[PDB]
């Protein structure tokens, strides 16, 4: 660190998906967050993060951090920004 870099929800999508918010890789993962479908089942399991825009997803994802834990995501986590 030097000064303090601003939190980046978009960059964290390129940390968990490393490509697309839709995650068109078929890894059973949605909202560019490598977040297990069995976990998303808490919010219905529905393709909500597949249809929800980047920022719309980050909103549901922000609450889903409390649902499963911040620890569910690796070193990458826009909740802290890094």
């Amino acid at each position: 660190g030097a000064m303090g870099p601003s939190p980046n929800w978009d960059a964290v999508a390129q940390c968990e998906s490393g490509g697309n918010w839709a995650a068109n890789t078929g890894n059973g993962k949605y909202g560019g967050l490598q977040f297990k479908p069995a976990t998303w089942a808490a919010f219905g399991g529905v393709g909500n993060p597949a249809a929800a825009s980047r920022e719309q997803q980050i909103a549901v994802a922000n609450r889903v951090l409390a649902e499963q834990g911040l620890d569910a995501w690796p070193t990458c986590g826009a909740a802290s920004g890094l």
Side-chain angles (χ1 to χ4, degrees):
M3 200 71 164
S6 288
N8 206 305
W9 255 110
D10 195 306
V12 169
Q14 290 197 287
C15 224
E16 278 287 82
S17 184
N20 294 278
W21 276 85
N24 50 13
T25 50
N27 242 323
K29 302 300 178 283
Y30 293 114
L33 273 182
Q34 208 93 278
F35 211 58
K36 246 264 145 66
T39 310
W40 201 262
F43 277 69
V46 187
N48 209 355
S53 305
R54 304 114 116 198
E55 203 181 279
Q56 203 80 282
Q57 208 305 283
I58 81 159
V60 194
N62 197 272
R63 210 138 182 182
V64 101
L65 89 82
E67 193 80 297
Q68 182 59 78
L70 72 96
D71 294 71
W73 293 277
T75 184
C76 309
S80 281
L82 260 178

